[PDB]
Amino acid sequence: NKYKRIFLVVMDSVGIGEAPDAEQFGDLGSDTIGHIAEHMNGLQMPNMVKLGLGNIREMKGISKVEKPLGYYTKMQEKSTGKDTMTGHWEIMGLYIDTPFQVFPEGFPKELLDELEEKTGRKIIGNKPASGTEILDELGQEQMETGSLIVYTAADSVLQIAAHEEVVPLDELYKICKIARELTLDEKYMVGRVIARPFVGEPGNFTRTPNRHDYALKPFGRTVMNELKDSDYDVIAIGKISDIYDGEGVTESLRTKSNMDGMDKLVDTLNMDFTGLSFLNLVDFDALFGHRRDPQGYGEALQEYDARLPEVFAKLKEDDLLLITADHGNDPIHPGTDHTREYVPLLAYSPSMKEGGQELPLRQTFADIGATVAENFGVKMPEYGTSFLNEL
Numbered sequence: 001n002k003y004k005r006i007f008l009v010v011m012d013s014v015g016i017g018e019a020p021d022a023e024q025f026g027d028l029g030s031d032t033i034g035h036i037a038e039h040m041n042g043l044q045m046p047n048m049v050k051l052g053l054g055n056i057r058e059m060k061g062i063s064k065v066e067k068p069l070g071y072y073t074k075m076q077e078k079s080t081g082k083d084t085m086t087g088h089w090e091i092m093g094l095y096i097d098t099p100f101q102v103f104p105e106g107f108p109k110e111l112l113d114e115l116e117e118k119t120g121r122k123i124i125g126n127k128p129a130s131g132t133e134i135l136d137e138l139g140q141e142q143m144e145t146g147s148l149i150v151y152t153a154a155d156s157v158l159q160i161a162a163h164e165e166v167v168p169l170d171e172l173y174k175i176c177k178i179a180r181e182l183t184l185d186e187k188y189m190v191g192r193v194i195a196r197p198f199v200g201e202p203g204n205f206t207r208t209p210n211r212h213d214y215a216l217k218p219f220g221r222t223v224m225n226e227l228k229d230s231d232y233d234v235i236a237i238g239k240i241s242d243i244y245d246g247e248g249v250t251e252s253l254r255t256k257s258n259m260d261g262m263d264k265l266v267d268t269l270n271m272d273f274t275g276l277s278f279l280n281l282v283d284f285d286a287l288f289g290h291r292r293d294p295q296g297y298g299e300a301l302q303e304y305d306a307r308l309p310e311v312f313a314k315l316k317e318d319d320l321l322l323i324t325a326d327h328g329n330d331p332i333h334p335g336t337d338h339t340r341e342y343v344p345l346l347a348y349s350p351s352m353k354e355g356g357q358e359l360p361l362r363q364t365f366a367d368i369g370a371t372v373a374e375n376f377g378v379k380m381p382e383y384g385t386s387f388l389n390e391l
């Protein structure tokens with residue numbers, strides 16, 4: 001192998017400006033990092049800068065450097081959707097024609113009707129809501145009627161809440177599996193179905209650790225699958241395992257925050273493995289992008305950047321670090337949905353003694369998967385062009 005270990009970091013939703021097809025999605029004007037940099041009166045990200053972030057695009061406080069640490073460019077998304085699953089599945093070598101849907105007005109009557117008809121239960125709620133706020137509003141009614149609280153969030157999810165002493169866990173799990181089947185339908189294509197059991201009484205409800213997530217398998221065998229099948233390590237950190245429904249994953253490390261994600265990254269740097277370590281930093285999307293909070297987003301980016309010098313110190317000559325994003329989620333943009341954006345790509349190894357250069361723009365996110373696959377000598381994905389030889 002050219003590289004023994006590849007550390008792939010997805011800064012979730014950290015887009016670098018509207019994609020050529022942004023208008024189709026109502027994303028004209030969108031610029032995640034650029035709008036954040038403006039809000040912050042200059043983003044402090046000196047380590048991303050040293051890697052060549054400003055060389056991709058200059059933004060407030062983010063300037064180009066004469067000798068970037070590694071190679072740099074941006075990537076264009078080819079798949080129809082702008083969601084996390086689409087982005088990650090494309091990164092690992094797929095092409096996804098069918099987008100996952102978001103439901104700001106709640107779910108279609110048709111879907112809920114069929115869910116009722118299959119389960120023998122009434123559905124209440126049917127709206128975007130915080131999980132905790134909807135229990136306060138409708139938890140008592142749920143308890144008294146044996147109905148199901150169905151709700152959504154800013155991303156492609158269908159969540160079913162039911163009290164554990166009213167609807168038995170196994171019944172809630174069966175109901176969610178039915179929901180999972182019904183939502184494999186392009187009329188209402190949902191990324192995840194999530195069981196949200198809760199306990200307690202009105203004014204004091206608690207969601208339990210019995211939460212279960214029902215994900216779809218990626219629409220194809222990914223580069224992770226091929227790595228796993230050739231006896232390589234695939235270490236998934238954070239939401240990664242869930243995003244791929246465990247496909248091609250050899251070890252999974254749960255994280256609770258971006259900082260904890262960077263701690264697990266460092267943990268993997270300390271591991272003797274050959275293969276891929278794959279981190280998702282999800283806070284950017286989950287806490288700041290959808291909530292349209294440029295200040296919190298800006299601060300999180302600065303907190304993330306400050307962690308990088310330790311990563312740089314631990315990388316070996318035969319390690320490659322790849323930093324990218326899966327889509328945009330501009331926190332100063334109308335509505336609550338992702339934004340169709342280019343994503344940055346930074347590729348760094350300490351073996352790059354003279355620093356890096358600009359790469360041709362990646363025409364699909366799958367160029368990452370192709371690069372990883374060529375590196376480890378496994379079956380090349382159907383889509384994507386490797387940049388391994390450019391490094």
Ligand SMILES: O=P(O)(O)OC[C@H]1O[C@H](O)[C@H](O)[C@@H]1O
Pocket residue numbers: 129130131132153154155157159196
């Ligand atoms: O905590 P809740 O409001 O029920 O759900 C919000 C999000 O929490 C989970 O990560 C899913 O991504 C949901 O979109």
Ligand SMILES: [Mn+2]
Pocket residue numbers: 025026027028333334335337338339
């Ligand atoms: Mn938009």
Ligand SMILES: [Mn+2]
Pocket residue numbers: 012013083084085087285326327
């Ligand atoms: Mn994402």
Ligand SMILES: [Mn+2]
Pocket residue numbers: 084155285286290329338
């Ligand atoms: Mn999201």
